[PDB]
mmCIF file of C-alpha atoms and ligand atoms in Angstrom:
data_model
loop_
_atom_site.group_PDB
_atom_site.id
_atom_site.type_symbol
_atom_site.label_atom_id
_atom_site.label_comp_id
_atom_site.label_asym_id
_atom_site.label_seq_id
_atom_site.Cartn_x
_atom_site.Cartn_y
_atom_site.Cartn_z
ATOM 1 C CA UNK G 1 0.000 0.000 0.000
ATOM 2 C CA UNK G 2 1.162 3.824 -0.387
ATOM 3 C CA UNK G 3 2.367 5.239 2.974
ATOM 4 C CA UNK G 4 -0.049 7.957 3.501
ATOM 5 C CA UNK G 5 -3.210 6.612 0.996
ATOM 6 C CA UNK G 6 -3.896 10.401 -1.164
ATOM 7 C CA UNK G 7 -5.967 11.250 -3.904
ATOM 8 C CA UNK G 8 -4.374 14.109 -6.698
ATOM 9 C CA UNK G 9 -5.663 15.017 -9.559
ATOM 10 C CA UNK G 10 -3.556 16.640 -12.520
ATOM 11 C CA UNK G 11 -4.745 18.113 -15.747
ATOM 12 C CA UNK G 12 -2.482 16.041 -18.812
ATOM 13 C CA UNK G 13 -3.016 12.976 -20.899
ATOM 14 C CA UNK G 14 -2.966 9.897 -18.680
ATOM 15 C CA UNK G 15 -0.598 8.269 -21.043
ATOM 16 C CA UNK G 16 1.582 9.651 -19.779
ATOM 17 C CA UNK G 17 0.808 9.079 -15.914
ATOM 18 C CA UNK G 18 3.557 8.208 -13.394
ATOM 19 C CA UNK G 19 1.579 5.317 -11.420
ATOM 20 C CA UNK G 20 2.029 1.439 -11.445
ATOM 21 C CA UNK G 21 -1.743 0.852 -13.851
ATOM 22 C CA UNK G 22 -3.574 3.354 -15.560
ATOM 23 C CA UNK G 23 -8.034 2.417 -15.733
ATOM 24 C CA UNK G 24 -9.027 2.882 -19.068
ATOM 25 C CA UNK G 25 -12.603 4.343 -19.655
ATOM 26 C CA UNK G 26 -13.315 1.722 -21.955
ATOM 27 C CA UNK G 27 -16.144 0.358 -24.302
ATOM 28 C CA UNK G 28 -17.472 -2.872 -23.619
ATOM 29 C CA UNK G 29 -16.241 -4.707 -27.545
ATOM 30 C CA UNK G 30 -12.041 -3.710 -26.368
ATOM 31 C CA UNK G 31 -12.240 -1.278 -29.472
ATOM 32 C CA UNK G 32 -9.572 1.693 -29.972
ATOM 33 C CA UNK G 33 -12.374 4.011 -29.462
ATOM 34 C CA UNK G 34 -11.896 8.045 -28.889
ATOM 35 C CA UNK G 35 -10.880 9.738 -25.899
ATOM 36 C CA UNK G 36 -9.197 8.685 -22.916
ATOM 37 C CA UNK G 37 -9.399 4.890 -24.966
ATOM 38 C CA UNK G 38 -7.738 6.232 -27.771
ATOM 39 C CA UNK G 39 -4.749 7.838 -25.987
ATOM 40 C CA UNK G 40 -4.437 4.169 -24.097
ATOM 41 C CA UNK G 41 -4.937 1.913 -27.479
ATOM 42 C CA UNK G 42 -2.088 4.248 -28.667
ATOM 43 C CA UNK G 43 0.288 3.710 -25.550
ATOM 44 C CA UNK G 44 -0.632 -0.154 -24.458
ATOM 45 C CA UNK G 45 -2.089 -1.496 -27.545
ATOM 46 C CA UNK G 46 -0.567 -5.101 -26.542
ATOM 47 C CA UNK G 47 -3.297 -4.606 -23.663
ATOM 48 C CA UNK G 48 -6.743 -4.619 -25.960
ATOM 49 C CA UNK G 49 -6.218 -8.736 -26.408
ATOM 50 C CA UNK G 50 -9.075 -10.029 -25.293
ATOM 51 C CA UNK G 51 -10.291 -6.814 -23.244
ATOM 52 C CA UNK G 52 -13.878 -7.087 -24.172
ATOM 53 C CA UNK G 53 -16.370 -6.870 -20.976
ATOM 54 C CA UNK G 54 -19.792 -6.148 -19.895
ATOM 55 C CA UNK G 55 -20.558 -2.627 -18.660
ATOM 56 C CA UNK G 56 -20.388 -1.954 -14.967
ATOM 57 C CA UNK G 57 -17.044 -4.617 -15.336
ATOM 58 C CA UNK G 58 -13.308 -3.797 -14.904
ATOM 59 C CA UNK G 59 -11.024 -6.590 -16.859
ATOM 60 C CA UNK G 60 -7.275 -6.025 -16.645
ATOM 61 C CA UNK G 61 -4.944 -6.946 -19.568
ATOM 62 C CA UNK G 62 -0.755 -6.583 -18.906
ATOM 63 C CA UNK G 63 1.260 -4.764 -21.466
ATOM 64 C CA UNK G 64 4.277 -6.223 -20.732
ATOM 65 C CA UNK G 65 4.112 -5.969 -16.858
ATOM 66 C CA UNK G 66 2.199 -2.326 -16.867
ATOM 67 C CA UNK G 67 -1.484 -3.433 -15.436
ATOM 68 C CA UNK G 68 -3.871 -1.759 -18.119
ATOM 69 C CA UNK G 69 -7.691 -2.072 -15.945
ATOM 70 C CA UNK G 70 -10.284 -1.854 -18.566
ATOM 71 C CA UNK G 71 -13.792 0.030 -16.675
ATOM 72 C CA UNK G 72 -16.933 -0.039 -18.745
ATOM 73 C CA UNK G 73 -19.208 2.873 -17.770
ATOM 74 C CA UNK G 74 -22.651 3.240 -19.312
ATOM 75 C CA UNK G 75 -23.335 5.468 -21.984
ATOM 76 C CA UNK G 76 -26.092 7.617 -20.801
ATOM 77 C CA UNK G 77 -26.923 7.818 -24.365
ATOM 78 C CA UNK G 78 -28.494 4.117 -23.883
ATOM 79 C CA UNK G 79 -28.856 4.095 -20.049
ATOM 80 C CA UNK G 80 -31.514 5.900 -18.111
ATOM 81 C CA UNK G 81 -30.854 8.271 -15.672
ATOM 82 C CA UNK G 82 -31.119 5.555 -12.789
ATOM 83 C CA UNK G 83 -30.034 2.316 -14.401
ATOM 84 C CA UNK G 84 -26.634 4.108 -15.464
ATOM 85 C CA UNK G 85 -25.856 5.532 -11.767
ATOM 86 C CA UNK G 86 -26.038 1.357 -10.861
ATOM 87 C CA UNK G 87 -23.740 0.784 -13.687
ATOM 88 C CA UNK G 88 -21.028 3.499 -12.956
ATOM 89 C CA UNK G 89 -21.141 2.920 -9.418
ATOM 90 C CA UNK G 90 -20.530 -0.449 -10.088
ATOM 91 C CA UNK G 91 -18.134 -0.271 -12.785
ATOM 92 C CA UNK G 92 -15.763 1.403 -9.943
ATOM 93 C CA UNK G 93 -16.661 -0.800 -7.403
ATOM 94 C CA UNK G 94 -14.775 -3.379 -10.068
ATOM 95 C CA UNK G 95 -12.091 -1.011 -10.438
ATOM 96 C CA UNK G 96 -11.413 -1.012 -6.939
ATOM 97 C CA UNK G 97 -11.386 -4.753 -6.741
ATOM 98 C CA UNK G 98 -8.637 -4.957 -9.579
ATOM 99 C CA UNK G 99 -6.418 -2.219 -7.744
ATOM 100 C CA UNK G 100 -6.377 -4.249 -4.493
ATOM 101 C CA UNK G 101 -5.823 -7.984 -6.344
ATOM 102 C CA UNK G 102 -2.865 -6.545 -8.599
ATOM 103 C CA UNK G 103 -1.063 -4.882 -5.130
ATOM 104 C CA UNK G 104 -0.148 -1.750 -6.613
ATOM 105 C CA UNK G 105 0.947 1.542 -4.832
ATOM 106 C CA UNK G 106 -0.888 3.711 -7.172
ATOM 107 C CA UNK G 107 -3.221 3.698 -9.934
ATOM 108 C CA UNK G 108 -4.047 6.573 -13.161
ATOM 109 C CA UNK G 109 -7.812 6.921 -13.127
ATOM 110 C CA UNK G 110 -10.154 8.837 -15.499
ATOM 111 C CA UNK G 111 -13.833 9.832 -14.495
ATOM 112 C CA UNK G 112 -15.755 6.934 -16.316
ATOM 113 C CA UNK G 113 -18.928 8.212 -18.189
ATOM 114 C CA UNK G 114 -17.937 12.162 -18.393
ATOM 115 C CA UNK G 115 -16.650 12.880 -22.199
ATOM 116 C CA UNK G 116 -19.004 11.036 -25.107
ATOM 117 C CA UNK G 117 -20.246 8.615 -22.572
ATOM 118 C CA UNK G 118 -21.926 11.683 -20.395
ATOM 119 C CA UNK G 119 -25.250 11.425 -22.876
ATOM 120 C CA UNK G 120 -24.455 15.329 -23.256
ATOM 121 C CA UNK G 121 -24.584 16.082 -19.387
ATOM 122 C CA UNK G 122 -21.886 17.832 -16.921
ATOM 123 C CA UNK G 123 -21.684 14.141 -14.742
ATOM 124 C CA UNK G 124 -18.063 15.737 -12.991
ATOM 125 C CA UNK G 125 -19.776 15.013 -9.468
ATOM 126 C CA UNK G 126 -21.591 11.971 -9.927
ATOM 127 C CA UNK G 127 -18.509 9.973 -11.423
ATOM 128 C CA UNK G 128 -16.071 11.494 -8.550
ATOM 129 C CA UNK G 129 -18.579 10.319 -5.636
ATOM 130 C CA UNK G 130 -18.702 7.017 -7.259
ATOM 131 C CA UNK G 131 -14.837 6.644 -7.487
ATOM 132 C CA UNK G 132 -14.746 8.109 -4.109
ATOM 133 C CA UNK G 133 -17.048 5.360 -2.717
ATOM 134 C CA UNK G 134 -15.212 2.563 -4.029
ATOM 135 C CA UNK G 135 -11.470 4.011 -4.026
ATOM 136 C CA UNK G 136 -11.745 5.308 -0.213
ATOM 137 C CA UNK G 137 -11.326 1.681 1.672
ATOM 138 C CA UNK G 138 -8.487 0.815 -1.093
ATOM 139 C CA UNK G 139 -4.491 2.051 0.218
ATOM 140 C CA UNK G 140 -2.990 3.139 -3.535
ATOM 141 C CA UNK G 141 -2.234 6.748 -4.485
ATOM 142 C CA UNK G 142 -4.851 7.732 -6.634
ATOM 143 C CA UNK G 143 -3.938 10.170 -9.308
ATOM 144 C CA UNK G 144 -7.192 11.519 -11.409
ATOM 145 C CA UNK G 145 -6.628 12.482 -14.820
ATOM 146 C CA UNK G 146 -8.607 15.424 -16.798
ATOM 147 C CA UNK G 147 -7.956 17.525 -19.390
ATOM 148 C CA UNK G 148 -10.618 20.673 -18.644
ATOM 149 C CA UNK G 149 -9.194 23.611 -16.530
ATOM 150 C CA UNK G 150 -12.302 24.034 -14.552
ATOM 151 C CA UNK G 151 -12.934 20.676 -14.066
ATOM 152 C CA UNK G 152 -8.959 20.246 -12.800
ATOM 153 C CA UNK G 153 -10.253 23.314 -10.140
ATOM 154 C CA UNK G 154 -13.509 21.524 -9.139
ATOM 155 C CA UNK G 155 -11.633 17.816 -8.782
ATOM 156 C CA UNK G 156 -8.920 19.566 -6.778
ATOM 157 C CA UNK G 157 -11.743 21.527 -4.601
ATOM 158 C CA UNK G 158 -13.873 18.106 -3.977
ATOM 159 C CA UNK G 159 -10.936 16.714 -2.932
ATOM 160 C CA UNK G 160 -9.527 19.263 -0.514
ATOM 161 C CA UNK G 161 -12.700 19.232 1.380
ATOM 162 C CA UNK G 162 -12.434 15.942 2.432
ATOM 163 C CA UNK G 163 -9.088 16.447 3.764
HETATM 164 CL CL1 LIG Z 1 -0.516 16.411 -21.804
HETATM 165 CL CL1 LIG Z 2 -16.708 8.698 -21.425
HETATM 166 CL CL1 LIG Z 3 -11.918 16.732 -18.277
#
């Protein structure tokens, strides 16, 4: 476990994180896809071998020994409001799972379901809580990736206030 268990967040591609695994935000058929998926088909390709899974699942794939953690939110496009909160919660609740079998220090997360999964809605809030609620009990460094300036502020805010 890390020392002194933190959560960061930090506004660049998480391609290039510093952590021991990196969660993709991943679609459910292991296709390149846009995004945050993209930028990790690019980096780990070697980990989209058989990476397909269900949403609300996390399946981990090694590139080489780097732990990529494959997390399936719901697009809200196809969800409704209420059966897609199940599935994100869940689909961290996996996340959090993987973390603790693999035994890493740290891990490189994205907020599942915020960019074209978000069904066109500002979900910054609802996708922290949920990684909140299943990251808290876990003892890596957690290091949140984003790319918005405002959203960097309101991560960074949420999670001052716990502290
Ligand atoms: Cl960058
Ligand atoms: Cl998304
Ligand atoms: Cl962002």
């Amino acid at each position: 476990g890390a020392m002194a268990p933190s959560y960061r967040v930090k506004r660049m591609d998480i391609a290039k994180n510093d952590e021991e695994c990196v969660v993709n935000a991943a679609n459910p058929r292991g296709l390149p896809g846009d995004g945050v998926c993209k930028a990790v088909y690019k980096k780990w390709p070697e980990s989209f071998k058989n990476s397909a899974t269900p949403v609300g699942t996390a399946k981990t794939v090694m590139c080489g020994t780097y732990p990529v953690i494959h997390a399936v939110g719901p697009n809200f496009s196809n969800y409704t409001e209420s059966e897609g909160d199940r599935e994100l919660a869940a689909a961290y609740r996996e996340v959090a799972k993987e973390v603790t079998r693999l035994g890493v220090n740290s891990v490189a997360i994205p907020l599942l379901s915020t960019g074209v999964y978000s069904g066109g809605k500002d979900r910054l809030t609802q996708s922290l809580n949920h990684l909140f609620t299943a990251m808290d009990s876990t003892d890596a460094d957690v290091v949140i990736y984003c790319r918005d300036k405002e959203w960097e502020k309101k991560i960074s805010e949420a999670i001052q206030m716990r502290t």
